[PDB]
Write a protein that holds these residues in place. Sequence first.
Motif, short mmCIF file in Angstrom:
data_model
loop_
_atom_site.label_atom_id
_atom_site.label_comp_id
_atom_site.label_asym_id
_atom_site.label_seq_id
_atom_site.Cartn_x
_atom_site.Cartn_y
_atom_site.Cartn_z
N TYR A 182 -12.51 -5.79 3.58
CA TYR A 182 -13.54 -6.63 4.26
C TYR A 182 -14.65 -5.68 4.53
O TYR A 182 -14.55 -4.77 5.33
N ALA A 183 -15.50 -6.26 3.83
CA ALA A 183 -17.06 -5.20 3.78
C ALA A 183 -18.22 -6.17 3.71
O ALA A 183 -17.91 -7.35 3.68
N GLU A 184 -19.51 -5.55 3.73
CA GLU A 184 -20.27 -6.47 3.27
C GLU A 184 -20.41 -6.28 1.75
O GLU A 184 -20.83 -7.23 1.21
N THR A 185 -20.88 -5.08 1.41
CA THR A 185 -21.29 -4.64 -0.02
C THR A 185 -19.87 -4.38 -0.69
O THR A 185 -18.93 -4.33 -0.21
N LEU A 186 -20.13 -4.02 -2.28
CA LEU A 186 -19.17 -3.84 -2.91
C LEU A 186 -18.77 -2.17 -2.76
O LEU A 186 -17.76 -1.65 -2.86
N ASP A 187 -19.73 -1.50 -2.60
CA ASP A 187 -19.79 -0.13 -2.13
C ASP A 187 -19.25 0.32 -0.90
O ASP A 187 -18.51 1.05 -0.62
N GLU A 188 -19.46 -0.53 0.12
CA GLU A 188 -18.76 -0.45 1.12
C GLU A 188 -17.39 -0.94 1.17
O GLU A 188 -16.53 -0.02 1.75
N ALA A 189 -16.90 -1.97 0.45
CA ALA A 189 -15.35 -2.21 0.08
C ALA A 189 -14.98 -1.11 -0.69
O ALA A 189 -13.63 -0.88 -0.32
N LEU A 190 -15.61 -0.54 -1.51
CA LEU A 190 -15.03 0.68 -2.21
C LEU A 190 -14.90 1.82 -1.34
O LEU A 190 -13.70 2.41 -1.34
N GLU A 191 -15.81 2.21 -0.46
CA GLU A 191 -15.54 3.37 0.33
C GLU A 191 -14.28 2.91 1.45
O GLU A 191 -13.53 3.55 1.84
N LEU A 192 -14.44 1.57 1.88
CA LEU A 192 -13.46 1.27 2.90
C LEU A 192 -11.97 1.37 2.14
O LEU A 192 -11.19 1.76 2.92
N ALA A 193 -11.81 0.91 0.97
CA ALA A 193 -10.50 1.06 0.29
C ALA A 193 -10.14 2.73 0.45
O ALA A 193 -9.14 3.08 1.13
N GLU A 194 -10.73 3.60 -0.22
CA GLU A 194 -10.48 4.93 0.10
C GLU A 194 -10.49 5.72 1.02
O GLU A 194 -10.06 6.74 1.32
N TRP A 195 -10.92 4.79 2.15
CA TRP A 195 -11.20 5.20 3.50
C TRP A 195 -9.92 4.76 4.35
O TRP A 195 -9.49 5.40 5.02
N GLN A 196 -9.70 3.61 4.37
CA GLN A 196 -8.37 3.13 4.92
C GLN A 196 -7.07 3.13 4.39
O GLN A 196 -6.03 2.97 4.93
N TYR A 197 -7.23 3.39 2.98
CA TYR A 197 -6.08 3.15 2.13
C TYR A 197 -5.42 4.36 1.79
O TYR A 197 -4.62 4.58 0.71
N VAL A 198 -5.55 5.28 2.75
CA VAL A 198 -5.07 6.76 2.61
C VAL A 198 -3.67 6.62 2.73
O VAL A 198 -2.67 6.97 1.65
N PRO A 199 -2.92 6.03 3.97
CA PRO A 199 -1.50 5.81 4.20
C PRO A 199 -0.78 4.78 3.35
O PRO A 199 0.29 4.38 3.26
N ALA A 200 -1.59 4.24 2.11
CA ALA A 200 -0.96 3.08 1.55
C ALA A 200 -0.28 3.74 0.27
O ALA A 200 0.45 2.85 -0.27
N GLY A 201 -0.40 5.09 0.22
CA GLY A 201 0.37 5.80 -0.90
C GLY A 201 -0.16 5.66 -2.39
O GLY A 201 -0.16 6.78 -2.90
N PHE A 202 -0.72 4.45 -2.69
CA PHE A 202 -1.39 4.49 -3.98
C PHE A 202 -2.69 4.98 -4.26
O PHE A 202 -3.14 5.61 -3.12
N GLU A 203 -3.14 4.92 -5.20
CA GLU A 203 -4.60 5.41 -5.19
C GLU A 203 -5.58 4.31 -5.66
O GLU A 203 -5.38 3.52 -6.50
N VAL A 204 -6.64 4.11 -4.89
CA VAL A 204 -7.44 3.14 -4.99
C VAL A 204 -8.22 3.28 -6.63
O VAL A 204 -9.28 4.27 -6.36
#
Length: 59
Positions: A27-49
């Motif tokens: 959940y972000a405003e832009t796609l770039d934001e969403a993109l960083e959001l993934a690589e940012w939040q999704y560290v303990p997710a195990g997979f690679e965004v």
Amino acid sequence: TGSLSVDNKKFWATVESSEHSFEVPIYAETLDEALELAEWQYVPAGFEVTRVRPCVAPK
């Protein structure tokens, strides 16, 4: 609620691994934001965004 894309900019970041590619709601405003959001939040997710796409749906 299956319709979680309620006005908020729901994105799907493809968190991929060798076996399977997953997707978690960003959940972000832009796609770039969403993109960083993934690589940012999704560290303990195990997979690679590998990708992030806009759901941009009312449902």
